[PDB]
Amino acid sequence: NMFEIAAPNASEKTIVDKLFQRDTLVRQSQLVVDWLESIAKDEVGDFSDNIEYYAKSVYWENTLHTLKQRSMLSLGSPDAPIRQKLPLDDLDREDDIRLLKYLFTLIRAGMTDEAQRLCKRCGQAWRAATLEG
Amino acid sequence: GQNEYVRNLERRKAFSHWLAHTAEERIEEEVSLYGPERHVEAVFSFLTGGRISDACRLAQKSGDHRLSLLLSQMVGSQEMRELISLQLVDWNKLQVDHYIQEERLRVFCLLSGTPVWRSSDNR
């Protein structure tokens, strides 16, 4: 009974652990989901357009260098692109789409630690902190 | 008034109760004056005067019950708030989180742990 043995001071973490320990059916569904995550389709890292072409040195580098310069007829002039649609550029949009497909495939396959390390490598502190939660 | 750690913690709890109680009346008066509540000031006043159980009811305009989940298991709050702070400082260093409400950012800095913030605009 140490599996569910706790006090009110025991955290929600230990709560989830005790629930998966005692609830055999939830744990069986979890093992089936773990098998599904293990046997999944994962994109190639350095041998496809996933990361081999998305090896960006800096995040929103295009948005920093240009200012809709691509969407301008001259030389011209995750909270910011949410508050103002006009910010994001096409290059960063496509690269983020690729990195997002990569991270989502990793999460669905269960490699969440590798997805966090990839968010750290790409400079995506936002997605990294989010995955940390 | 009169385990060392436990004793210190109990004293801390009593002092916190005193602080909350001595400011309670003032905080209640202030809130009545606010009228339509504003997360810039209302939330600041609630946070410094405690009463987080009622603060959550006040934050239902956006919807917030992770706090009920906190009252259930008072645990790991330190690390939760620290991760919030990390996210906030990342936003600050990324030149974003600027076109948002002025003192909303002020209140975010409070949970972060920085009592005085010199921003890029030298504010």
Task: Tell me what the structure shows.
Chain A: It comes from Xenopus laevis. Chain A: It is found in: Chromosome, Centromere, Kinetochore; Nucleus, Nuclear pore complex; Nucleus membrane. Chain A: Plays a role in the nuclear pore complex (NPC) assembly and/or maintenance. Required for the assembly of peripheral proteins into the NPC. May anchor NUP62 to the NPC. Involved in nephrogenesis. Functions as a component of the nuclear pore complex (NPC). This is part of a larger assembly, with chains A (133 residues) and B (123 residues). By secondary structure, chain A is mainly α. Chain A is 55% helix and 0% strand. Chain A contains seven helices and no strands. Chain A is elongated and about 70 Å long. Chain A starts with 11 loop residues before the first helix and ends with a helix. Chain B has 123 residues and is an all-alpha fold. Chain B has helices at 4-34, 42-48, 52-58, 68-72, 77-93, 102-112. The N and C termini of chain B lie far apart (44 Å). At the A-B interface, helix 1 and helix 7 of A face helix 5 of B.
Helix content of chain B: 55-70%
* Strand residue content of chain A: under 5%
SSE pattern of chain A, N- to C-terminal: HHHHHHH
Q: Report the end-to-end length of chain B measured between terminal Cα atoms.
A: 44 Å
What global shape of chain A is seen? elongated
| Helix proportion range of chain A | 40-55%
SSE order of chain B: HHHHHH
The outline of chain B comes out as: globular
What assembly state would you assign to the polypeptide chains in this entry?
part of a larger assembly
The number of E-state strands of chain B comes to: 0
Family (chain A): Belongs to the nucleoporin Nup84/Nup107 family.
Protein name (chain A): Nuclear pore complex protein
Subcellular location (chain A): Chromosome, Centromere, Kinetochore; Nucleus, Nuclear pore complex; Nucleus membrane
Function (chain A): Plays a role in the nuclear pore complex (NPC) assembly and/or maintenance. Required for the assembly of peripheral proteins into the NPC. May anchor NUP62 to the NPC. Involved in nephrogenesis. Functions as a component of the nuclear pore complex (NPC).
